[PDB]
Design a protein around this ligand. Structure first.
Ligand code: CLA
Ligand code: CLA
Ligand code: CLA
Ligand code: CLA
Ligand SMILES: CC(C)=CCC/C(C)=C\CC/C(C)=C/CC/C(C)=C/CC/C(C)=C/CC/C(C)=C\CC/C(C)=C/CC/C(C)=C\CC/C(C)=C/CC1=CC(=O)C(C)=C(C)C1=O
Ligand SMILES: CCCCCCCCCCCCCCCCCC(=O)OC[C@H](CO[C@@H]1O[C@H](CO)[C@H](O)[C@H](O)[C@H]1O)OC(=O)CCCCCCCCCCCCCCCCC
Ligand SMILES: CCCCCCCCCCCCCCCCCC(=O)OC[C@H](CO[C@@H]1O[C@H](CO)[C@H](O)[C@H](O)[C@H]1O)OC(=O)CCCCCCCCCCCCCCCCC
Ligand SMILES: CCCCCCCCCCCCCCCCCC(=O)OC[C@H](CO[C@@H]1O[C@H](CO)[C@H](O)[C@H](O)[C@H]1O)OC(=O)CCCCCCCCCCCCCCCCC
Ligand SMILES: CCCCCCCCCCCCCCCC(=O)OC[C@H](CO[C@@H]1O[C@H](CS(=O)(=O)O)[C@@H](O)[C@H](O)[C@H]1O)OC(=O)CCCCCCCCCCCCCCC
Ligand code: HEC
Ligand SMILES: CC1=C(/C=C/C(C)=C/C=C/C(C)=C/C=C/C=C(C)/C=C/C=C(C)/C=C/C2=C(C)CCCC2(C)C)C(C)(C)CCC1
Ligand code: OEX
Ligand SMILES: [Cl-]
Ligand SMILES: [Cl-]
Lengths: 334, 97, 32, 137, 244, 30, 36, 51, 33
């Protein structure tokens, strides 16, 4: 054992309170940089000219935001997709005005989070586990890539990336509806199905295992004290929960293989969230939601509005008001 | 003391007629014959003291002065408003459809 | 920013009162 | 309501002589107006020059006037500016410029009359929606 | 030399006016029977200075330097106009057209951003009388117009504008309007600035001149909402002079 | 004052992270 | 700023090298069952 | 006379003019100094200067 | 009256902080018994 090997063993040690890992050797610095830049910027960054029209948007607390309205504001549209590291600016004052912190944070963050995924694989290998938790995390990771990288690439600017704020996130959702009619896109409908049903099945599983917990405590103590960490036996009667739940609907609508039951819980929301991340990724290239505007017309040819035309009226309200000083020509093509 | 100069102008002849000193060039589509040739000439030769100085534009043709007389009743001149003529707003005022 | 004066006292007690409850309950659990 | 001959009656020339189209032609002109004109003219606006719509009242103050089928077939053969003072076949598809605007090659005089019929009928049906743009969608 | 967009793209040189050797100290003969024109005039600012503003004490306002934050986007160029010979021998430049304005934001100590419309719109600059030739001691002085930094369609964060926009503070339905007038009522400023151009290099061969300039003008006033700052711009210019 | 309040509460949460991880109840194999 | 550029260049490079070399240092054997 | 020297000659900057529960900056009290108004000379109807 | 607004948060914490300290110490004394 020499210097390199002692280090290699520390890095991949399964005795560290927090696993490090080769993926962690990248994740730790990139996440730290992003987290420190994000916190300073959120509190103190001065206004950022997000839309490139010399009209700065104040995102930080010290400049009169609160927790809900504050943000790290995306980098200037004048920058488009150009790389804007600190060293490319003439002064930090220039880097701040033009929104450099958003580039630094998102790049370090996306790098950091891709290696988090990798680190989940890595530790599972050292622990003797099956490897695929990192596959589940890939649904939220891709989702984040979609709003922070892909959608900017398709539209040619990080100025149309998702802002790092609570209200900025809403701005981003609203403008998206106007430009892509995302509600009418099947992949986002799959993501709603992803998350409603993931919440639905999460209550169902909690409610059902909780229902069939085996008495092991008295009325005064928490029932939680009837499980002991590491115990070999199960704390609940799955036969009984299948018996409740098979009758609630019918016998075959109900799982009786615990393995089949948990793979279903993993698979449902992960798939759904893959699809909505893909929906954001593809609407990045302007393949938008179904367009049924004026799809119904009468014998003479008058337009017979459906609910889709009513959506489109709201969409148009979003369209004409958003970024109200930034368009000189009549189509908003990116 | 603080007034919107554009609202003020709406209460003038500008609000009823084509102000040859102010109105964006697309308002000349309203009347047969004017657009785009004469409107460009009208706009280029800039401001006028009187509506009828438009007939003295150098190089007009006889067909053109006749069209212009046919429409003197649709024109007016008021003072030039910096806010309507700056930024090239007489050629493109941000309005499309 | 012209914010609410009572907002500070409402926020502070909102944190302080329920937190102290939990702290009282936890420390006397430990000492028995 | 339905599609009637009173609706399908449109000016044939500026002297007043009308012609009365049929269901089959109006649909042909909508189908050909799509193929040929909707890219810039969808809904009766003009995307590459919003100041100029296909509203029947705009085609009236055109020089030469255009609110009749002959006037329109002529525009589609040899188009001009609104005042008539210039020919714009170089930047506006027409039979004249069918070499640079291929979609115009395979059209016949009956096709052009279908397309004008459509244009002159469509505002009878939709009114302000035709040539209004997004306010009216 | 023949330089191409690809040689230049991305370097910062697109924002720089041409220069001449230190041997371009000739003299261009000006010929009264002739008409002349500036085929290109190019101004490249190098420093933006912004007048301080004392307290009540009427002490002293110095021009403090500023930090440019809007990058290499500041130069006026491609400007053309008639160089008239006048009867008192002087030369007068009357601008016609060009990229004669660039909006600019500089920062002051403390964090205040000062935007301004760096411009020479409708420039009319004249030399001294009885100028037979442009030498490396020839000066122009002139005045230009400075239109409002934003034009009439510009809408403020609450949707208010001059030619468009809400005419009131809609989020405060029943506030007293009196206290909000300066902000509810956009006004479009139009002002004048002064500029000295000092020819320091002449190429009589080609009729190329180059020197430095100094201009004074007002900053953005935000369509009437606050007072402008006095701003002083220094840089270099280059002009080619063709017979017209 | 409201800036200070937002940041104080943020900072309290970060300290809570530190203790919840490093001074957790250790899980025991019983 | 040039000083910053170079410091980040050197930093990133060094970490990037840990990651590669680390995985090359017989990472498939670093597991609790088959040391192979 | 520099205004900075005249401002020292003013009891409002005397640290012994305060109070235990009068909180905050001195500016919260007499206000933010903007200008020296001038040095004031009193005379009676006789032309005698008074102090 | 034109009373200082932080008077209130000052008074409330002056009371609550040391009171809670003592309550914490007392309660966990009594559950030692
Ligand atoms: C795991 C470590 C890690 C990683 C992967 C990154 C990654 C990045 N940083 Mg961050 N950074 C880190 C740690 C890290 N950082 C730390 C610890 C700090 C604090 C000091 C920072 C501070 C920081 C700042 C202040 C900035 C970045 C920026 C960036 C981005 C571009 C960096 C670049 O051009 O390098 C290029 C990398 C290479 C050329 C190395 C490639 C690897 C090959 C294999 C070798 C190449 C040899 C190389 C050229 C020789 C260099 C020496 C030579 C000059 C003598 C990228 C997201 C910039 C940014 O976000 O802009 C938007 C930026 O402004 N970083
Ligand atoms: C009145 C109740 C109601 C019902 C029945 C639905 C139903 C639906 N909504 Mg809506 N939704 C509701 C209220 C409701 N919604 C409300 C109050 C809001 C907020 C205003 C929304 C907002 C919303 C959005 C934004 C979207 C939907 C979508 C959907 C679809 C997916 C549902 C899903 O995955 O849920 C999770 C539940 C499950 C996965 C369980 C299975 C659900 C199915 C539908 C029931 C089983 C049917 C069964 C085969 C029939 C019995 C046959 C028998 C022989 C066994 C579905 C058509 C999405 C959509 O448009 O899809 C078209 C979509 O994008 N919902
Ligand atoms: C009932 C209404 C309803 C419902 C249920 C949904 C549901 C959803 N929408 Mg839709 N939306 C709606 C209405 C609705 N929407 C309306 C009305 C509009 C129009 C105004 C839209 C417009 C819209 C847009 C434009 C987008 C959505 C998206 C989404 C998704 C959000 C969750 C997500 O991305 O998870 C995925 C998970 C993540 C993004 C999290 C990633 C986490 C990273 C990897 C780690 C984070 C670490 C963190 C920083 C630190 C944590 C550590 C710390 C705690 C210590 C989801 C499928 C988004 C989508 O599909 O994105 C892909 C999207 O971009 N919506
Ligand atoms: C050596 C300590 C020290 C000193 C000399 C100062 C001095 C100053 N500070 Mg700082 N400050 C300090 C510590 C200190 N500070 C600390 C520790 C904090 C964090 C709490 C602050 C936070 C702070 C803020 C947030 C602000 C100041 C400000 C000020 C100025 C106004 C002070 C004022 O009005 O007080 C008034 C003094 C009192 C009201 C006296 C309080 C003492 C009471 C009467 C006693 C308490 C009761 C006690 C229990 C007695 C009974 C006990 C018995 C049983 C034995 C002044 C220059 C202010 C300023 O002008 O900002 C620029 C301002 O806004 N300070
Ligand atoms: C006048 C009149 C008519 C009155 C007379 C009435 C009367 C008394 C006479 C008889 C009436 C008669 C029977 C006629 C019927 C008429 C008729 C059909 C009525 C209409 C009813 C109808 C519309 C119902 C639709 C059915 C419906 C609501 C749901 C079906 C959808 C469905 C199958 C989805 C459930 C999804 C599913 C299978 C499970 C996933 C959930 C999940 C992950 C749970 C987690 C989980 C599962 C487990 O499994 C176990 C184990 C554990 C641990 C666990 O975590
Ligand atoms: C216990 C200790 C206290 C707990 C922590 C404090 C919690 C306070 C949370 C309430 C926030 C109050 C607003 C912020 C403070 C402030 O602005 O108040 C300020 C206002 C008082 O209003 C004051 O009025 C003055 C003239 O009287 C002036 O006009 C001031 O502008 C105005 O601030 O506070 C109150 O009005 C409190 C009323 C509370 C009762 C509300 C009834 C509705 C409740 C039903 C909701 C059910 C919830 C279901 C949830 C599950
Ligand atoms: C082991 C854990 C350790 C964690 C420690 C946390 C790290 C803390 C991060 C703070 C680092 C930022 C300091 C930047 C120094 C500013 C100097 C300066 O003059 O600029 C400060 C200002 C920035 O801008 C002005 O900042 C002011 C702060 O009050 C005001 O807010 C003004 O309004 C604002 O405009 O700009 C300048 O004056 C100089 C122009 C640029 C020339 C500086 C070259 C150095 C480049 C900085 C690169 C930072 C890299 C940080 C990574 C280090 C982490 C190891
Ligand atoms: C744990 C700490 C929390 C628990 C303690 C409870 C709070 C205790 C409150 C004590 C302070 C009461 C002061 C209230 C004044 C206030 O509200 O105004 C708030 C004032 C600040 O002043 C504010 O300033 C503003 C502009 O900044 C405006 O002037 C405001 O009007 C003005 O109120 O608070 C202070 O100045 C805090 C300073 C405290 C430091 C004093 C140190 C010197 C004295 C030390 C002597 C030790 C004595 C030993 C005793 C034995
Ligand atoms: C005709 C048109 C053109 C062609 C189109 C082709 C369509 C057919 C494609 C078929 C797809 C293949 C099946 C899927 C894989 C599978 O079978 O899993 C294998 C397991 C094994 O089941 C288990 O099987 C076990 C035995 S064994 O392992 O299968 O051998 C048994 O022990 C256990 O009890 C039992 O549950 O399946 C499950 O556990 C059963 C529950 C059903 C869930 C599986 C599907 C995944 C759900 C995602 C839904 C996405 C929603 C997105 C959000 C809106
Ligand atoms: C499909 C064959 C058609 C038909 C039938 C028409 N257009 Fe166009 N159009 C375009 C532009 C820029 C103009 C304005 C031209 C100008 O005067 O500068 C027009 C104008 C017309 C008119 C005149 C309408 C009027 O109000 O007078 C008419 C009758 C007309 N068009 C018919 C642009 C385009 C295109 C962009 C490439 C396309 C394609 C077409 N037009 C297609 C057609
Ligand atoms: C060695 C090692 C390690 C460690 C490492 C680490 C731990 C790192 C760290 C890192 C770090 C620690 C980093 C940092 C970064 C940061 C940054 C980069 C920041 C930035 C900032 C800035 C840039 C800002 C600015 C501003 C704003 C925003 C506003 C206001 C003003 C100012 C100017 C301040 C490990 C374990 C892996 C293993 C291997 C080896
Ligand atoms: O930046 Mn942000 O937002 Ca997507 O389109 Mn174009 O751009 Mn702007 O407009 Mn709509
Ligand atoms: Cl917006
Ligand atoms: Cl645009």
């Amino acid at each position: 054992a020499n210097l390199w090997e002692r280090f290699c063993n520390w890095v991949t040690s399964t005795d560290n309170r927090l696993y490090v890992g080769w993926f962690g050797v990248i994740m730790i610095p990139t996440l730290l940089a992003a987290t420190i830049c994000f916190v300073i910027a959120f509190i103190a960054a001065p206004p950022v000219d997000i839309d490139g029209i010399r009209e700065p948007v104040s995102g930080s607390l010290l400049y009169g935001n609160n927790i809900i309205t504050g943000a790290v504001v995306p980098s200037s549209n004048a920058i488009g997709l150009h790389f804007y590291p600190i060293w490319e600016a003439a002064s930090l004052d220039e880097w701040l005005y033009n929104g450099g912190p958003y580039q630094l944070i998102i790049f370090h963050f996306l790098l950091g989070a891709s290696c988090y995924m990798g680190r989940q694989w890595e530790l599972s290998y050292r622990l003797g586990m099956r490897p695929w938790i990192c596959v589940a995390y890939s649904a939220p990771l891709a989702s984040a890539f979609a709003v922070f990288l892909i959608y900017p690439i398709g539209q040619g600017s990080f100025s149309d990336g998702m802002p790092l704020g609570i209200s900025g996130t809403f701005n981003f959702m609203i403008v998206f509806q106007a430009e892509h009619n995302i509600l009418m896109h099947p992949f986002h409908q799959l993501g709603v199905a992803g998350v409603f049903g993931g919440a639905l099945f999460c209550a169902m599983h909690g409610s059902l295992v909780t229902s069939s917990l085996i008495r092991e405590t008295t009325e005064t103590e928490s029932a939680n004290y009837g499980y002991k960490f590491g115990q070999e036996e199960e704390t609940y009667n799955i036969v009984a929960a299948h018996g409740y739940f098979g009758r609630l609907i019918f016998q075959y609508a109900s799982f009786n293989n615990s393995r089949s039951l948990h793979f279903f819980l993993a698979a449902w929301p992960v798939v759904g969230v893959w699809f909505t991340a893909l929906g954001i990724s593809t609407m990045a290239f302007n393949l938008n939601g179904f367009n049924f505007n004026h799809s119904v017309i009468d014998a003479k040819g008058n337009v017979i509005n459906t609910w889709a035309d009513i959506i489109n009226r709201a969409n148009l309200g979003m369209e004409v008001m958003h970024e109200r000083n930034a368009h000189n020509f009549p189509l908003d093509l990116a | 003391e603080l007034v919107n100069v554009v609202d003020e102008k709406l209460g003038t002849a500008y609000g009823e007629k084509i102000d040859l000193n102010n109105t964006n060039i697309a308002a000349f589509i309203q009347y047969r014959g004017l657009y785009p040739t004469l409107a460009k000439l009208i706009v280029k030769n800039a401001p006028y003291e009187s509506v009828e100085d438009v007939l003295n534009i150098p190089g007009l043709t006889e067909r053109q002065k006749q069209i212009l007389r046919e429409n003197l009743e649709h024109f007016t001149v008021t003072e030039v408003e910096t806010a309507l003529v700056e930024g090239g707003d007489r050629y493109n005022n941000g309005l499309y459809k | 920013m012209e914010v609410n004066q009572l907002g500070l006292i409402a926020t502070a007690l909102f944190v302080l009162v329920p937190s102290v409850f939990l702290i009282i309950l936890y420390v006397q659990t430990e000492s028995q | 309501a339905e599609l009637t001959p009173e609706v399908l009656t449109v000016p044939l020339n500026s002297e007043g002589k009308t012609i009365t189209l049929t269901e089959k032609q109006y649909l042909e002109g909508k189908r050909l107006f799509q193929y040929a004109c909707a890219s810039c003219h969808v809904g009766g606006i003009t995307k590459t020059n919003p100041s100029l719509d296909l509203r029947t009242e705009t085609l009236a103050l055109a020089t030469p006037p255009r609110d009749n089928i002959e006037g329109l077939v002529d525009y589609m053969k040899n188009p001009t500016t609104y005042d008539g003072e210039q020919e714009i076949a170089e930047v506006h598809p027409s039979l004249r410029s069918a070499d640079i605007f291929p979609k115009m090659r395979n059209l016949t005089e009956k096709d052009l009359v279908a397309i004008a019929g459509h244009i002159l009928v469509e505002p009878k049906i939709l009114g302000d929606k035709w040539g209004g743009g997004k306010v009216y969608y | 030399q023949t330089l191409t967009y690809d040689d230049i793209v991305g370097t910062g040189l697109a924002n720089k006016c041409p220069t001449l050797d230190d041997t371009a100290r000739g003299a261009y003969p000006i010929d009264s029977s002739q008409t002349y024109r500036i085929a290109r005039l190019c101004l490249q600012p190098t420093t933006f200075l912004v007048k301080e503003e004392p307290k009540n004490k009427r002490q002293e306002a110095e021009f403090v330097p500023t930090k440019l934050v809007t990058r290499e986007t500041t130069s006026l160029d491609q400007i053309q106009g008639e160089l008239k010979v006048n009867s008192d021998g002087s030369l007068t430049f009357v601008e016609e057209d060009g990229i004669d304005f660039q909006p600019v934001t500089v920062q002051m100590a403390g964090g205040e951003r000062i935007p301004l419309l760096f411009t020479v719109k409708n420039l009319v600059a004249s030399t001294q009388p009885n100028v037979t030739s442009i030498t490396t001691s020839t000066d122009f002085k002139g005045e230009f117009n400075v239109p409002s930094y934003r034009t009439a369609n510009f809408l403020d964060p609450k949707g208010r504008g001059l030619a468009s926009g809400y005419d009131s503070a809609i989020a405060l339905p029943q506030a007293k309007e009196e206290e909000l007038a300066r902000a509810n009522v956009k006004r479009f400023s139009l002002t004048k600035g002064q500029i000295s151009l000092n020819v320091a290099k002449v190429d009589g061969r080609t009729g190329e001149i180059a020197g430095t300039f100094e201009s004074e003008q007002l900053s953005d006033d935000d369509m009437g909402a606050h007072e402008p700052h006095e701003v002083k711009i220094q840089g270099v210019f280059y002009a080619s002079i063709e017979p017209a | 004052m409201e800036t200070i309040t937002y940041v104080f509460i943020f900072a309290c949460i970060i300290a809570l992270f530190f203790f919840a991880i490093f001074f957790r109840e250790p899980p025991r194999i019983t | 700023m040039e000083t910053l550029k170079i410091t980040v260049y050197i930093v990133v490079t060094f970490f990037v090298l840990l990651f590669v070399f680390g995985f090359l240092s017989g990472d498939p054997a670093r597991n609790p069952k088959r040391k192979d | 006379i520099p205004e900075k020297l005249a401002f020292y000659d003013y009891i409002g900057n005397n640290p012994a003019k305060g109070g235990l529960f009068r909180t905050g900056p001195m500016n919260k009290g007499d206000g933010i100094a903007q200008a020296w108004k001038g040095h004031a000379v009193f005379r009676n109807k006789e032309g005698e200067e008074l102090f």
